[PDB]
Design a protein around this ligand. Sequence first.
Ligand code: L1T
Ligand code: L1T
Ligand code: MG
Ligand code: MG
Ligand code: MG
Ligand code: MG
Ligand code: MG
Ligand code: MG
Lengths: 236, 236, 5, 5
Amino acid sequence: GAMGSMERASLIQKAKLAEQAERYEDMAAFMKGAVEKGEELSCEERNLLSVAYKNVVGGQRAAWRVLSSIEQKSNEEGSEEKGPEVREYREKVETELQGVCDTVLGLLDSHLIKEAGDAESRVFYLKMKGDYYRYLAEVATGDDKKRIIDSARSAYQEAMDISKKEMPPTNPIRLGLALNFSVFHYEIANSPEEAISLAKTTFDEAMADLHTLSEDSYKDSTLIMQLLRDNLTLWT
Amino acid sequence: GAMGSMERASLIQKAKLAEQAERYEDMAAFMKGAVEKGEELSCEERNLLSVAYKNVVGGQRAAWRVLSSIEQKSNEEGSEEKGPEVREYREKVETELQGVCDTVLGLLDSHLIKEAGDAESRVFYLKMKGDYYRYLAEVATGDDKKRIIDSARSAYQEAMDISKKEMPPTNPIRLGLALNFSVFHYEIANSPEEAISLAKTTFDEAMADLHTLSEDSYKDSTLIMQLLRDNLTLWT
Amino acid sequence: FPATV
Amino acid sequence: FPATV
Ligand SMILES: Cc1cc(C(=N)N)sc1-c1ccccc1
Ligand SMILES: Cc1cc(C(=N)N)sc1-c1ccccc1
Ligand SMILES: [Mg+2]
Ligand SMILES: [Mg+2]
Ligand SMILES: [Mg+2]
Ligand SMILES: [Mg+2]
Ligand SMILES: [Mg+2]
Ligand SMILES: [Mg+2]
């Protein structure tokens, strides 16, 4: 590990600096180094890890979608052959994306999840496992595609089960998990009705619990509730 | 060269795909590979090269400025010591930026400039040489700082001399060169009056030549003229 | 695309 | 910052 010689606290500090500088690849490398110190992560540290990799993989996904669209158009009837280059470059971006997902999943499996006993940490990591298997599923086409989808589903389901037992329905981790699992159902599992049902039930159960919250918690929860409503509007 | 096995035309095609996908680091690597094939670059290819590296170094410069500002605040009177991390990380970004500039300057010196005989190509490359020495000067503090500034000046001056002899005053390469050399004077050479004089004379001489142009050339030239006016408004 | 966090 | 191209 290229970060093995740097203090854990220095890695965390530099991750925060990298975030301010919008250097998300650096931020992800620093947080990977911090995880590899072997200690559990605090809530703030978990969010630095997730922000870093979400931005890295989000850029890769956006690029993959552009290239996939060009490739599909190059393969339509009447298109002029342009050679192997579009496929090759889409494959290059795809392989880099898969590498990032494998890296995150590797951190979760060695050993973040197994040491995470509190609901806030364990649900957060299982949500991340579902998300990164979901990103693998977006690009998957081979013998293992169904197993990739099922790995995402299984991680999301375990996170959901814990969240329903241990967290209030307005907890922002629980809300974001449900938002993302609902998107998994719509876009990956070809289950739009399940996606819509989950988003609606999540929104309504959160609504009914808002009365318990402070102003700041209310803002956190209603932000994610608005995303649930945005998706419901897109889908209905 | 990791691109040595890929056809020149394939590198150019992939650079264009990388641009569409906003993958500018890839786009720059592909164009470096294309330059290293040893053939001269067409106008379109020169612009792919410049777009790629401008975006890469522009991101590095933006990050360097954020980190430099944090570092300066950490060094003010009354600030709490935060350790070496801010300086270290600013230095890391700075070294990567210097590496990109050295790479571009190396391409220009081996062997783009020496083979560039037409004004459009030679002025373009000398402008790029001035620009990348200017980016080095923005971060320079050591024994060679004055020589870095003078290298930028010398490249810009040679480009200016050729452009005035060989190009009309509305030529967009000539306009962009003047815009950038004017910024060099203002921000690097501590010569704001020279910067303002150059921007004004460039704008006025272009204005007087617009009547010769087609609608499409008029659009190209007036776009850059507006940037000259924007800077003049910032500076006066 | 739909929203995720 | 001022404009450059
Ligand atoms: C939720 C969050 C996101 C953060 C970031 N993008 N840097 S820091 C952070 C947090 C969490 C818990 C306690 C204090 C700060
Ligand atoms: C000016 C320019 C920028 C380009 C780009 N960002 N891809 S291609 C291009 C050009 C130049 C000359 C002839 C045809 C195309
Ligand atoms: Mg230690
Ligand atoms: Mg593949
Ligand atoms: Mg249910
Ligand atoms: Mg060949
Ligand atoms: Mg240095
Ligand atoms: Mg003069």
